[PDB]
Write a protein that binds this ligand. Structure first.
Ligand code: HEM
Ligand code: HEM
Ligand SMILES: *Cc1c(COP(=O)(O)O)cnc(C)c1O
Ligand SMILES: *Cc1c(COP(=O)(O)O)cnc(C)c1O
Lengths: 496, 496
């Protein structure tokens, strides 16, 4: 019978007040990097601490809000730490021989760290992740040379179909394969103990009041909170758990209907062995809406390009830190970057689709946002045949006094655009001949519009395109670029 | 008449051998960052140098190959540098007042840097970029609070339709707006001169043989090559230009048919004023296939998550560095990360769509089982249940019949999903559901169809996206396949 419960009780004899000399675990202390890194893996760690300027003050925090930005790691997640460590330790033990297969269950960040390290070190990497997690992760992982396996998001960790289960069963079917097991492996919270904490302390000079961390596996908050209780015992430790996860305390917090949430990387249906919950001063529950709102807010206001996990974390921070007073400080952990999330919470249509945005919140938009294209008043352009030449094009455009002609067809299909400036530039530069076909100088890419369309829609199209042609369902009523819209609005600015 | 040619001749009186004390320009030397960065903008610079282990040896270079990875910058591109600089300098002149609109033409990295800086400092940002550029860039930009305008990619820099032109016109229509103009602005190559180069020297101790850089605006290669000719004069400077760009020398190299290319960020139809071509010892022409092949090779082999620009640069490096002998070194510049390119060269289907990949090669790389029928697995026919059935009955039936997993079908014949003994049991036992409850609460909704005549490779892909693959006809399921089944098959064949 081969499986090992990730929820098993911790056999660790560590307790607060124990002399650090009693530890059986092998510790490696942070060091100084050489001028030239022998491989990218040494770029893991020494992440910057950054003051949060606008947002802290927005919500009424009187204290100093710092963020440890962990998305500057090689893989761009905090997991890159524990990956490296877990492997290195595994190499010392002689457990992991070169040319051996690694298998890991993950939210996909750890999978990334491991796949990366494997790409470097020649290990064969096999990842198992739930089907919820973003496709960007899959892309990166596949690019790294990792084999990928997915599990149902709905599966309970007991069940065979859960990522852990599948992982273990694969491990049974693959010769000379190992599972580092971030849930049971000392190397994860240890890696957070030896390095991350030291970094935070050194960066804070050793003076710190409150610390906020979201908890997936607990490793981060575990190592950090332990080394903190030792070195800066006056620091409150705040855990962050998504609703639908059973991790927090007291259990009264976990009473909820929905079993699933959109945020990736945090929360679980079980208690990981590496998690020590006794070191957490208080827990806070976060939801998806909070998370994504604060992540988007974090990017837009603070310029921190970071994941939704971070969003949750700060979302809690602005509440939990309220009790603090000026002169004090609160450090927040930001786990990963937007790179994984590109198509999800960054995309407004996904945020709308998932019900994290009410269309009413039309409130943010400028006055012109709802108006018809008709209000511009436009003009009717001149159309030409595709068989026409360049020279004749210049002739006609100048003679009629038009800068731009859409190229239409006898069939009625619009093929594109030509413009006087670009025609002239091309000929003059000897790129084309006056006898040459328009078809190359032509601008192929454009987008259709109805007179009854809204100017906002125009703005979007203009975020994706230079030309917008107003049409029916055959013929073009006008030609619009950003500049036209701008002329209009500006003209309205003077009309007040 | 307001426009200023980005291709204007350089009025700079700098020439090799001039004492740096003669420079009218204001220089700021690199400094040491405080423990706590006052804002994310200070995280720009001090990018790591990293040895390239596998590829250099792969292509027969005897020398030490270093890469300055500039994608660890805040915005994730080299452009973040010149962004910050351009603003700070503009603030010294008093030219840029707080609350003023910034307008910039860009390939989009510069735009990202600017949008970021503006977001932090409260400036209003307006970006203008060609329609070639990736949508990921657009996404990040929009998240940053930047307004976006696109221009035709085929547009000549002369023409009204080019990004520079559109930018200038916008400047005409907006009150109190500035254009920092990365093409004419001293601050760009100066920023590469003061910092980047210094960093490179310090990292190499001052000992360097060859330097390879791709050139979009020239700022990088210019600043760097100047400070290099001054400090380490024996260093060869190699430019990289995409085919279809006129930047290289002698002009004999620029003779080509195609006018456009997929690589973002490098090459232009004009000669930027900040570009000094006289400091470039040699030019090399790169294409798209080279670029992407080496970018993918770079990620997979070296674990460097980087853009296609970098791909071009190394693709040249493996050639240009051939003349070197062991004991020497060649430093290569890597401009940006995969975050911008996520849906393009990283995606295999896009690489196939664009003809950068011959299917023959993919079929060559693949393992032996890759082309085989699902039928060869031999499978089994599963047992199906109705959705109105309860949980208890599900367990009863499954154990009684000796099956682990059942598909849930319909009287209509529509497969609603999957149920499994393990998850049912786990569910009940954890008290999430009741024995009298309907199956759907436990049911696994997400799966994917397959035909017996499908190939095992297709299965591998699907298994990259899905847990269950149901082999079906055109109401009947011939089988159910997971990663583990495929693995049982392969393992059994390895065993024989
Ligand atoms: C004076 C300090 C410590 C002592 C004496 C100690 C002692 C132990 C012992 C005896 C075990 C069981 C060994 C085994 O059965 O394999 C153990 C397991 C473990 N310890 Fe510690 N430990 C200390 C500190 C820490 C710290 C600071 C961390 C994390 C930051 C940590 C994380 C773990 C983990 C994850 C395990 C594995 C739990 C398991 O396998 O069930 N320990 N420790
Ligand atoms: C002793 C060194 C230098 C001297 C004396 C010098 C002098 C000048 C002068 C007189 C101008 C014209 C200013 C104007 O009309 O706006 C100029 C422009 C410029 N310089 Fe320098 N320069 C020096 C070094 C450099 C270096 C090292 C770089 C960058 C690697 C650089 C980049 C530029 C640029 C981009 C311009 C603007 C070109 C233009 O306005 O047409 N310069 N310089
Ligand atoms: C794993 C992870 C976390 C949680 O970190 P733990 O140390 O497991 O508590 C948070 N966010 C992301 C994106 C993660 O990958
Ligand atoms: C701008 C840029 C370059 C070129 O840098 P220059 O200083 O303009 O020569 C290369 N790659 C990318 C992705 C860029 O954005």
């Amino acid at each position: 019978p081969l499986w090992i419960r990730p929820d098993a009780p911790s056999r660790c004899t560590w307790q607060l007040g124990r002399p650090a000399s009693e530890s059986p675990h092998h510790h490696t202390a942070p060091a100084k990097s050489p001028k030239i890194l022998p491989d990218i893996l040494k770029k893991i760690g020494d992440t910057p601490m950054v003051r949060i300027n606008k947002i802290g003050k927005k919500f009424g925090l009187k204290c100093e809000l710092l963020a440890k930005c962990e998305f500057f790691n090689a893989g761009g997640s905090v997991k890159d730490r524990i990956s490296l460590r877990m492997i290195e330790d595994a190499e010392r033990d002689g457990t992991l021989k070169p040319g051996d297969t690694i298998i890991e269950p993950t939210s996909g960040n750890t999978g990334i760290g491991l796949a990366l390290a494997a790409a470097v070190r020649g290990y064969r990497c096999i990842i198992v992740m739930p089907e919820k997690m973003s496709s960007e992760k899959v892309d990166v992982l596949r690019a790294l040379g990792a084999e990928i396996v997915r599990t149902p998001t709905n599966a309970r960790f007991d069940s065979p179909e859960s990522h852990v289960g599948v992982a273990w069963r694969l491990k049974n079917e693959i010769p000379n394969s190992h599972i580092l097991d971030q849930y049971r492996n000392a190397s994860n919270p240890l890696a957070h103990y030896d390095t991350t904490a030291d970094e935070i302390l050194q960066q804070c000079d050793g003076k710190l009041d409150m610390l906020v961390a979201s908890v997936g596996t607990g490793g981060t908050i575990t190592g950090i909170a332990r080394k903190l209780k030792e070195k800066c015992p006056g620091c409150r430790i705040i855990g962050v758990d998504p609703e639908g996860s059973i991790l927090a305390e007291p259990e009264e917090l976990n009473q909820t209907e929905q079993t699933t949430y959109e945020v990736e990387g945090i929360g679980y249906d079980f208690i990981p062995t590496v998690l020590d919950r006794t070191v957490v001063d208080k827990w806070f529950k976060s939801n998806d809406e909070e998370a994504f709102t604060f992540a988007r807010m974090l990017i837009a206001q603070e310029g921190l390009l970071c994941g939704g996990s971070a969003g949750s974390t700060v979302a809690v921070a602005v509440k939990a830190a309220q009790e603090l007073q000026e002169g004090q400080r609160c450090v927040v952990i930001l786990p990963d970057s937007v790179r994984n999330y590109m198509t999800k919470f960054l995309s407004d249509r996904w945020m709308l689709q998932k019900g994290f945005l009410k269309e009413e919140d039309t409130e943010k938009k400028p006055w012109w946002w709802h108006l018809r294209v008709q209000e511009l008043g436009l003009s009717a352009p001149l159309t030409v045949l595709p068989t026409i030449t360049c020279g004749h094009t210049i002739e006609i455009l100048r003679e009629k006094g038009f800068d731009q002609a859409p190229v239409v067809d006898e069939a009625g299909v619009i093929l594109g655009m030509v413009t006087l400036g670009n025609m002239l530039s091309s000929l003059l530069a000897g790129k084309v001949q006056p006898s040459d076909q328009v078809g190359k100088v032509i601008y192929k890419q454009f987008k259709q519009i109805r007179l009854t369309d809204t100017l906002g829609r125009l703005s979007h199209i203009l975020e994706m395109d230079h030309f917008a042609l107003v049409v029916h369902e055959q013929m073009v009523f006008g030609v619009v670029t950003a500049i036209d819209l701008l002329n209009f609005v500006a003209a309205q600015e003077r009309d007040q």
